[PDB]
């Protein structure tokens, strides 16, 4: 089934200015999207802001300004930030968008018509900061912004409060068995595996029905009214998850503004998401609530949910993304964030370690290799030479390069971006050691014919690795390709994953008096 490859980030609460967590989540979305574009697939990548709810309304209240003005302002900051981060996102959705609201109401009506919504009560704990319902097992003792004793969430340590309200309830309990059938029949649907196991365990234990409306006073009337009942507002999370369906149905102009909402998602061939990128803190909403709603409404389920080790949202200790990018570089910062962390919080995020990787991997491994195989001193004719016969050592390197695209492909599709970067750099380390071994600088004098072969393999190794790194180093890959003089046509497509796609005789790009890809940093 050829559809548009649909990849999403979460939509972020606009209670506060954007920070590194949002940038990280959206980066992963952007990288996956970029990889599928380089394979020559159709891609629609989605991000945005989650604008309704008690959390957000109370934050605007505390800034003494109207929700409308506050949300618009903060949304603007998210956009400026993401533009400044040089992503390639196809659309930025806001839950205040009038077309999104219509989609929420269509979905709600579908659920109601299906018989899965009834009027009941929620009497239990709620976390406003998480907009999450909690059972007594999931709270404990703590302190508020005062220092008075209170109950806090085990999930997140945020203050909880007791809620007793007549609410519309979704019959989530009825979806236990179907969700279980789904997890088992599609064992790649939640990544990484240990989070998939968490979800199954939780659903095995049983599911209560879920409150999908709240009394309007509680939400400071900042939410979507329930269809046919204006005394209730729709649960911010049902509203928010629906952004994925909304975005799948929006025709967007070349300026990035929405211009039209189609009736049927199949018209745009995006829905369901191929990959929802999320943080570990919002797994239940995406892997339990969302599929249950979709099953109720009769919509198709997502293919993969990937939950990274950071928190979607959190917190004298700062790490500004634009500030580190101006200091160290945008591509380098991105590389670091994707290289340092797997599916875990931990990871040395110090300046010390950022410099170690910049200098070690980007400068000494990658950049060193690019300069050497393009240098006037070694590549005396500034072209791709024609290879002479290959030794066994030559072929061992060629084999590594030939296998690399298959290996990196699989990693990108898990998706495990860290493992893909590590694969590419294993191959770059090999290319270096080959070059050390062959000493092509010595060959210019001694064996020009042997140099052709060595030089050709090196150039092609650098081209292939660079192509596979182009989703991670989008600007630098262009600079590298320009230096190698790679024609535009050979800068994407699975055709160009093959060894030898650029023919001998291709001319290198011009140089510049002083010119470094990644310049090293002091300590």
The residues binding ligand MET (CB under 6 A) are 10-13, 50, 240-241, 243, 282, 312-313
Shortest CA distance to 94 belongs to which of 28, 47, 29?
A: 47
222: Cβ contacts below 8 Å, ≥ 6 apart: 52, 53, 54, 56, 57, 67
239 token code pair: 């509203």
Residue (of 15, 82, 8) closest to 47 by Cα position: 8
Look up tokens 């290996």; give the residue.
Answer: 407
Q: How far is CA 471 from CA 27, 33, 479, 514, in A?
A: 10, 8, 14, 27
Find the shortest distance in angstroms from Cβ 127 to ligand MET.
12
Nearer Cβ to ligand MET (29/496): 29
Task: Output 13 or 412, the one with its CB closest to ligand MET.
Answer: 13
* Rounded least distance, CB 376 to ligand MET, Å: 52
**In DSSP terms, which residues pair with 226 in a beta bridge?**
229
| Closer by beta carbon to ligand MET, 310 or else 336 | 310
What minimum distance in Å lies between the beta carbon of 55 and ligand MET? 8
- Vertex 161, ends 159 and 163: CA angle to 5°? 155
Nearer to ligand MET, 311 or 349 (CB): 311
| Shortest reach from residue 22's CB to ligand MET, in Å | 8
Are β-strands 43-50 and 304-308 bridged in parallel, bridged antiparallel, or unpaired?
A: unpaired
Any idea of the CA torsion for 329, 333, 334, 338, to the nearest 10 degrees? Answer: 160
Nearer to ligand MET, 97 or 374 (CB): 97
Nearer of residues 241 and 362 to ligand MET, judged by Cβ: 241
Would you call 298 helix, strand, or coil by DSSP?
coil
> What 8-state DSSP symbol labels residue 153?
E
Q: Is the CB of 50 or the CB of 416 nearer to ligand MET?
A: 50
Kindly tell me which of 10 and 321 has the beta carbon lying closer to ligand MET.
10
Q: What are phi and psi of 249, to 5 degrees?
A: -110, 10
Residue whose Cβ sits closest to ligand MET: 50
Smallest distance, ligand MET to C-beta of residue 240, A: 4
CB 10 to ligand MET: min, Å: 4
Q: Provide, rounded to whole angstroms, the least separation between the CB of residue 71 and ligand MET.
A: 12
DSSP string, 190-241: EESHHHHHHHHHHHHT----EE-EEETTTTTT-SPEETTEEEEEE-HHHHHH
Q: How far is the CB of 324 from ligand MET (least distance, A)?
A: 22
Strands 304-308, 190-191: pairing is parallel
Neighbours of 236 (CB within 10 A): 24
Q: Supply the minimum distance, in Å, between the C-beta of residue 349 and ligand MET.
A: 21
Encode burial over 348-358: b for 16+ CB neighbours within 10 A, e otherwise: eeeeeebbebb
Distance CA 186, CA 237 (A): 25
- For the chain, what's the residue count? 523
Report the nearest approach of ligand MET to the CB of residue 14 (Å). Answer: 9
Handedness of CA 244, 250, 253, 259 (dihedral sign): negative
C-beta closer to ligand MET: residue 240 or 307: 240
The residue among 300, 338, 367 whose CA lies nearest residue 471 is: 338
Task: Report the Cα–Cα distance between both ends of the chain, in Å, rounded.
Answer: 53
Beta carbon of residue 94, minimum distance to ligand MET (angstroms, whole number)? 12
Q: In the complex with ligand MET, which residue's Cβ is closer, 238 or 397?
A: 238
Cα–Cα distance for residue pair 246/256, rounded to 1 Å = 15
CB nearer to ligand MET: give 76 or 406: 76
Phi, psi of 277 (to 5 degrees): -85, 125
Which uninterrupted H or E stretch holds 520? none
Q: Smallest distance, Å, CB 224 to ligand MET?
A: 14
For strands 250-252 and 258-261, give the pairing: antiparallel
List all residues 6 or more positions away from 362 whose beta carbon is below 8 Å from its beta carbon. 332, 335, 517, 518
Nearest approach in angstroms of CB 26 to ligand MET is 12
Look at the block and give the residue holding tokens 């909402």: 261
* Minimum CB distance to ligand MET smaller for 232 or for 313: 313
For ligand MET, the closer CB: 168 or 235: 235
């Amino acid at each position: 089934v050829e559809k548009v490859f649909f990849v999403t980030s979460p939509i972020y609460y606009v209670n506060a200015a954007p920070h590194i967590g949002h940038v990280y989540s959206t980066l992963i979305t952007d990288v996956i999207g970029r990889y599928h574009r380089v394979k020559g697939e159709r891609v629609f990548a989605l991000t945005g802001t989650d604008e309704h709810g008690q959390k957000v309304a109370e934050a605007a209240k505390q800034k003494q300004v109207s929700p409308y003005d506050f949300t618009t302002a903060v949304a603007g900051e998210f956009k400026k930030c993401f533009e400044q981060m040089d992503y390639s996102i196809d659309y930025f959705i806001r839950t205040t968008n009038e077309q999104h609201k219509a989609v929420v109401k269509e979905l709600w009506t579908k659920l109601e018509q299906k018989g899965d919504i009834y009027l009941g009560r929620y009497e239990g704990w709620y976390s406003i900061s998480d907009e999450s319902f909690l059972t007594p097992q999931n709270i404990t003792d703590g302190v508020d912004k005062d220092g008075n004793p209170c109950k806090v969430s085990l999930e997140s340590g945020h203050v909880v409060t007791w809620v007793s309200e007549e609410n519309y309830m979704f019959r989530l309990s009825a979806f236990r068995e179907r969700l279980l059938e789904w997890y088992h029949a599609n064992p790649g649907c939640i990544v990484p595996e240990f989070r998939r196991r968490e979800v199954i365990r939780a659903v095995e234990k049983g599911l209560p029905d879920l409150s999908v409306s709240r009394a309007r006073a509680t939400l400071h009337n900042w939410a979507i009214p329930v269809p046919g009942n204006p005394d209730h507002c729709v649960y911010v999370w049902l509203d928010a998850l629906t952004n994925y369906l909304t975005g799948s149905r929006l025709r967007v102009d070349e300026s990035g503004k929405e211009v039209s909402l189609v009736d049927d998602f199949n018209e745009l061939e995006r829905f369901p998401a191929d990959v929802h990128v999320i943080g570990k803190d919002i797994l239940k909403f995406h892997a339990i609530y969302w599929p249950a709603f979709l099953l109720s409404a009769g919509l198709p389920l997502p293919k993969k949910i990937v939950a990274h080790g950071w928190w979607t949202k959190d917190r004298g200790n700062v790490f500004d993304p634009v500030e580190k990018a101006e200091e160290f570089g945008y591509d380098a910062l991105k590389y670091f964030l994707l290289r340092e962390s797997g599916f875990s919080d931990d990871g040395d995020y110090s300046d010390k370690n950022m410099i170690a990787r910049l200098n070690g991997e980007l400068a000494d491994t990658l950049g060193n290799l690019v300069m050497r195989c393009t240098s006037a001193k070694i590549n005396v004719n500034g072209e791709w030479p024609s290879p002479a016969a290959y030794t066994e050592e030559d072929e061992s390197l060629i084999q590594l390069i030939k296998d690399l695209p298959g290996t990196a492909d699989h990693y990108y599709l898990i998706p495990d971006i860290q493992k893909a970067i590590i694969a590419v750099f294993d191959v770059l380390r090999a290319i270096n050691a080959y070059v050390t071994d062959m000493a092509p600088w010595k060959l210019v004098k001694t064996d020009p014919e042997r140099l052709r072969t060595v030089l050709y393999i090196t150039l092609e190794g650098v081209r292939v690795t660079t192509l596979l790194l182009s989703p991670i180093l989008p600007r630098k890959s262009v600079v590298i390709f320009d230096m190698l003089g790679v024609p535009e046509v050979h800068r994407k497509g699975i055709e160009n994953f093959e060894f030898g796609a650029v023919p001998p005789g291709t001319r290198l790009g011009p140089a510049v008096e002083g010119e470094v890809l990644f310049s090293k940093r002091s300590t």
